[PDB]
Amino acid sequence: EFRPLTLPPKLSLSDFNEFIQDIIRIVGSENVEVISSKDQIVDGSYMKPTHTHDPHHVMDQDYFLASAIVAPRNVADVQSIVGLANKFSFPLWPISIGRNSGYGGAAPRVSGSVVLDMGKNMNRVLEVNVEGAYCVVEPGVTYHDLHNYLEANNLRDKLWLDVPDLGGGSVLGNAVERGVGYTPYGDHWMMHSGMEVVLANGELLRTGMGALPDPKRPETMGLKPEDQPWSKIAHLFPYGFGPYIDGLFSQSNMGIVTKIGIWLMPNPRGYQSYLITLPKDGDLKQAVDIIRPLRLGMALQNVPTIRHILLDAAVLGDKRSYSSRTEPLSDEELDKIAKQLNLGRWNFYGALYGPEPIRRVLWETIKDAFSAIPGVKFYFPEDTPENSVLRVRDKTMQGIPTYDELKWIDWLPNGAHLFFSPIAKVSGEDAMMQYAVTKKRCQEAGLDFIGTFTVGMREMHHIVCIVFNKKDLIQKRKVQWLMRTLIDDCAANGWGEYRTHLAFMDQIMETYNWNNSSFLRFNEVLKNAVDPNGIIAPGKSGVWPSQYSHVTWKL
Amino acid sequence: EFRPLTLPPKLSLSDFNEFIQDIIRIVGSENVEVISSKDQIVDGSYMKPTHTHDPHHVMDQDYFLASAIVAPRNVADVQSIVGLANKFSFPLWPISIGRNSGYGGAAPRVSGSVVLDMGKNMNRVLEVNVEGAYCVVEPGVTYHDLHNYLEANNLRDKLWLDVPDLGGGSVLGNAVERGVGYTPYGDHWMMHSGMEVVLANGELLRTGMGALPDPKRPETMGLKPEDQPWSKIAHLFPYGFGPYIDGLFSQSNMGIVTKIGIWLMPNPRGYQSYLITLPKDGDLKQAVDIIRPLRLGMALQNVPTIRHILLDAAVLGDKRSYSSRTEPLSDEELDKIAKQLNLGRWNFYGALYGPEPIRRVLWETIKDAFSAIPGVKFYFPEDTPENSVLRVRDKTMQGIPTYDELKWIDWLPNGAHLFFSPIAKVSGEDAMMQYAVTKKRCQEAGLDFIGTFTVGMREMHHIVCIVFNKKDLIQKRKVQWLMRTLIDDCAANGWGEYRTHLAFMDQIMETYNWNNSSFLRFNEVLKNAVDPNGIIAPGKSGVWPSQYSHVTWKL
Amino acid sequence: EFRPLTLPPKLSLSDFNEFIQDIIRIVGSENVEVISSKDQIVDGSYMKPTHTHDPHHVMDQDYFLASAIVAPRNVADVQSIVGLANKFSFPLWPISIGRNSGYGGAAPRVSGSVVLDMGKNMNRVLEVNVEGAYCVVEPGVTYHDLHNYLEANNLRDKLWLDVPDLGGGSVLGNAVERGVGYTPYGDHWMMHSGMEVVLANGELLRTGMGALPDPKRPETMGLKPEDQPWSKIAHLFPYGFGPYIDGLFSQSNMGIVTKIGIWLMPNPRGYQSYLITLPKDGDLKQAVDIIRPLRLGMALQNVPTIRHILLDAAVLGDKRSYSSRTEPLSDEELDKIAKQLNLGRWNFYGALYGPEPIRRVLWETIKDAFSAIPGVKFYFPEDTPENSVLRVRDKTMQGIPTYDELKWIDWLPNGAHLFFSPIAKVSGEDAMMQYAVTKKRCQEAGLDFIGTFTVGMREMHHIVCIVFNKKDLIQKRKVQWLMRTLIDDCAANGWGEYRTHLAFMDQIMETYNWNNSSFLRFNEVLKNAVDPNGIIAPGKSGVWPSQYSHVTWKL
């Protein structure tokens, strides 16, 4: 192709063309795709995501967007594309799914970068092992896919998949990002073992036990490395020997991941989702406290989550379908809708897994425990309307993917998500302060507060869901203002964020400045040591290669 | 475009083309302009200046001239043009107006440079603030423009503009040059506060308080830096904190200026221009002495100026309209014309600003003071013919722009100005010696001496106006000879020059050689430290980047 | 000497000794002085300042302190000391007086640095010129000194000195710092012309017209450069030709200054100080507004200043002599003391200079103007008690040095000053907000608010005077907390600070971060370009040489 709408910094159109020309020769035209005009800038749908830019853009739509897209056919092309990238110093921005909405979608930090669609061609479920209770996968496999493969293979009775909400995401893409899931295997990054990745220099590298080579049998001779089998222990024990490098690969530009080992929970032989509606707003506090011990003590098995009232309603309906009002709904109105929906001003969904005797016993403790809360009310999925959010999470908390959840994106007219996600202690006091701070700022911006706590063992990921209409330019600015403000406030009160969208990786990395940004400095050292040319995703997580001046690039 | 008439040193036509090609893609054809042929080399008019070379060329017309011209649309293009310039090592030569005639006009020091017309597109009066009594401006705003904007806005009653003579110049272009003006705010460079400029590396930089960022309001979110607002104090206090760098930006190649804060005098509530004709030639001496104390003591408010007789006549008429003679007019003839015109052999114009009581009082002191001079005669504008130079300066000394002054350029046939401008003490003895030295050399060259002293607090800028016919090649050589000689003589008697034309920046910088050119050496260090590639205006003020050999370049 | 109490980073005692040994050989033992023990750490008196560390230490007393001190005998030694410093990479920290208390005194940013006492030996008033109305000076001359020299020479009738409060400071030390003064020549940095300084490489450099060499007469032959005379125009016109570098020398580590030209106001031939007491606290607001126009309009000639009630009382007496109370005095109590002292809750001191007719006229306007304020009352110095602060400023506003002002340092027991100094618009609204913010934080810290506005043309330097007892460790921490907090708040509201103490140069430079700290980055580039080894005052104004890691050094 000829002329991209925008281009990588410090590069001639004459260069873009030779570069793209060569890629087309490698992956063939079917694979490459240049961004020549506005008609190409379409904001897709979750079902068919756009790989050119951010769908949920708080910023200008055409702000972050690719010079082109390229789907490598397999590892070898990746290695090759990598080498050309080095010759031209062209920036790459890898992605498996493009599903990362509310975090910038497929858009690259630095505009005019070539986006690698790792997913298109490397789509394969490489293995599923019952005894090891794990499977291996390429960037292409979405959760639904895996679920089907288990089901096609009748393996679903043998092993369950853990899943985030919307089931479309890339299993590994979500895992390198350290995304949350609902079953006991909810910590995605925790559950991996052995990875494979292309270095900036294009050299291959397996990790952990991935490194101990499978002995040579006559059948495996001649295989290219990428195609060679892993050793028996690779997917069973993560540590290997010597330094444990895997972390360098999460939320960072250190390299491109090509495959990855992920554990799978053996069917527990028991299950029952449940719900507990908390009547009042302030009940959030005692609730969290009651939970703290139940979590550490293992009463609560999976990653339970406290959901705000609006979140369950948003799934049930549009803001319009409840109030003609154009501003944040009052506490009164909030009390009203819960009455209409049979939910609490806060609602704790979670689950029990195991044989009946364990289940019965835990159920008791849990019910007995939450009773101290005046007005609590316990429902089972059966005990509820056939549309209820509980009837949906019941599948989620058992590895069944769904998409009923996107409906909440629809609260306003032109739906667009944007997640603020600070971390918070498993304390009623801390969780109450955080909620109040996030709420007031939301009110200041004219938006309805909406969110859900996801309970980890010693912490909770507070997920503020900023929905906003993607066409009001003013609203967007307010939103930007909103995010920027919240970040600073939570910072000023000990709260961090575990992930964010492109427009704020820079700001967020600065909050991590203990001892003079020592953490960021150590990274860049690693960064430059590993990728001299800054070819791979510069700016991801705020890490910049020496080539990009922090003055011109930061933001 | 294809082939420039001349080109930058060390560069292939193949390179010029790729470079220009890319610029055309950025600013679009309307903006770029290549110098392909002689028909392009037109010497304009003050009213419509030529951006390709020196209009008043003492040197060969086609000596200093551009390879092309380019008008950036806004800051972003400047940053971009800058980056390409670095890739090719192509020299830039920025300009806002092109109005700098008598100092080489729009012509670049090194030929084949691309000239940046900063003025065309960045034409905006960014702000006018009554309480701060200042305004902000882009390179595009000429004095007339500002005056109109104040007038359109009815603000003229609230704040007055200070102005040099011909009102066409760029307000900032004149200010970075440290040009003189007539009201109390006559020191242009003195009156600025906060600037913005593009470094050779293309990074943006505000200065002084310009650096303290305006807090983030929801309305200002997302704005590109160049478009972001300045903090409240930026334009009110020049110093900021730490080193005061602004000076690196005056009369130098350190960077490109994009906007600048300039003060504005609040309407004084009183005004009356005046004149005092000195009868004899030698009266210059006592006059200067009488003034010295009146300046320090604040009797004389604005920048008054002693004008030679010929200067006022030149405005009134052509040398032809007074004498068929082809050589410098005799003292006798000079005495004659003043009699015809009612002026002295020297004439002191100046002004009073304030309420009547202050005005009356100062007027007394001033009149009483100048009386010691036998034959002095005091006129008010009213007291004079309706063409008188005084009726003109009356507007000048009150911020009203005009253009009546160019008429003096017309003394000879093909008018061309060339300013010699040494500095001189506020002393009758020193001012008399300087005048005599400049005069004799003028006579040696066959030219009529013409000039005006502009009185600063502790010094006077002696401005010799070399008019000469731009077509006599011989006259030109004499002129060159004239300048070269004067520079050395005044040097040999402690006199410096505050500014000059391209053909003598080198010579002039050498006069500043105390301690082995230590001053020049310190600059080049800064120069190279800041612009490794010497992309920005090399040779301006004699400062050369390490790339240009002093042997090949000096002159 | 043998072993310093502390030492420069990255240096062996073996090296310190060879280094010091050599210096002793150059300047001779009388000149050098090593800091071996605690008995050396004495906190002096303003009258006899300590050159080893900070007298007013908010931080630990022995925190910032020298490895030794050295008084160069003259320029040549400076050049020499400089060269050795480069051989060892030993850090220097120059000072003329050591008088900079409330800004860290003589203490260096980086501990174990050698402190250059520029003042001891280079003590000379090099020149006083009546016609040019300026004089020249070495680091050694304090204001009192100059005043005496004018007086000894009977020149006091011919020219007045401008002066800050306490008359002990170095005339140039205060000027490079850009300190404030009271007469019309109150802007110290503004009033200079021509400087001389030693580069990090030890090469000499005159600036401005300083560069144009004085022609060679037989009498001046053979003179070393440092001893050579300046050209006639050097001290009369600051700009010179080409870049105006002087600013690189204010508040920065770019070089050591050895001499400097300073203007002197010709005796005005008229004078009368005055006072106007504002009754209420809130009257600050209308007062500022009434002043704004009087400043721009030139009604108010010199730098007038609005003084808080406590400030005038502190000079009159100890907090003890007014209230046994141990906490901030109430608005009621404040109203009381003013009644006792005959002052307003705010008090505007200022002056008139000129012949009677101008004086009378201005006086009218000023009185008439301030009348709108209910209860205002106008006193002349005569009209007041023989101890009144007005009887003191009357000398200050006429160039007479004094020291009556230190008495205010005595409000608490162990007096120690610490200045917070944000800049503020000449607006009642802006000045009121700033005052309120600074006050509340002061109350939070248990300290009495105390301060004075110093009125510039378009701005006011708000000077918060933090007095605190130098022995309460707790109070100190509160103070540190106080400063840190105020800086951030004023930042968050557009307010900057024009100067500060060592412990906060780093924080203050960070407020200046527009566009990603672009301003700081440009400086360090200049810094390293000019002093490769970071030998000169690293850390001054937060500028660090490449050798000092920002992680280890910042603070």
Ligand SMILES: *Cc1cc2c(cc1C)nc1c(=O)[nH]c(=O)nc-1n2C[C@H](O)[C@H](O)[C@H](O)COP(=O)(O)OP(=O)(O)OC[C@H]1O[C@@H](n2cnc3c(N)ncnc32)[C@H](O)[C@@H]1O
């Ligand atoms: C709209 C929404 C989003 C959402 C959610 C609910 C709704 C209504 N619930 C989520 C949940 O419960 N848990 C969770 O982790 N995320 C949830 N989201 C957000 C989002 O939909 C998911 O996180 C989703 O998994 C993200 O998209 P996907 O998984 O497809 O990831 P991607 O588009 O490929 O982006 C991945 C990023 O990581 C880096 N990356 C990706 N692949 C590679 C490879 N091969 N090598 C190196 N780096 C890689 C990139 O930096 C990319 O930005």
Ligand SMILES: *Cc1cc2c(cc1C)nc1c(=O)[nH]c(=O)nc-1n2C[C@H](O)[C@H](O)[C@H](O)COP(=O)(O)OP(=O)(O)OC[C@H]1O[C@@H](n2cnc3c(N)ncnc32)[C@H](O)[C@@H]1O
């Ligand atoms: C013919 C004449 C000229 C004249 C005058 C009277 C007559 C009859 N009276 C003047 C006066 O009273 N005071 C004065 O300062 N100049 C007077 N002149 C000379 C001239 O007309 C004016 O000085 C005029 O202001 C100069 O032209 P202009 O103001 O348009 O400046 P320019 O053409 O842009 O050239 C500016 C130079 O400075 C540098 N420059 C300019 N812009 C930038 C930016 N943005 N960034 C960096 N550097 C910049 C260039 O080096 C350029 O050469």
Ligand SMILES: *Cc1cc2c(cc1C)nc1c(=O)[nH]c(=O)nc-1n2C[C@H](O)[C@H](O)[C@H](O)COP(=O)(O)OP(=O)(O)OC[C@H]1O[C@@H](n2cnc3c(N)ncnc32)[C@H](O)[C@@H]1O
């Ligand atoms: C306690 C106090 C202080 C004070 C004041 C009232 C009171 C009660 N009133 C002041 C005023 O009205 N205006 C003002 O500017 N300052 C006032 N102060 C503070 C202080 O007393 C004065 O500012 C005083 O002038 C500062 O001390 P001094 O003038 O002696 O300066 P120094 O001790 O030499 O420190 C100078 C700093 O600048 C750099 N420096 C100094 N000399 C050089 C040389 N030769 N070369 C390079 N840099 C130099 C150093 O960085 C040093 O820190």
Ligand SMILES: CCCCCCCc1ccc(O)cc1
């Ligand atoms: C409580 C049900 C969850 C639905 C939406 C979860 C949104 C979400 C999940 C994980 C993230 O890292 C960021 C955001």
Ligand SMILES: CCCCCCCc1ccc(O)cc1
């Ligand atoms: C006395 C009236 C002035 C008209 C012409 C002034 C010419 C001039 C002004 C400023 C310069 O820096 C150089 C030249």
Ligand SMILES: [Cl-]
């Ligand atoms: Cl998802």
Ligand SMILES: [Cl-]
């Ligand atoms: Cl002009």
Ligand SMILES: [Cl-]
């Ligand atoms: Cl002082």
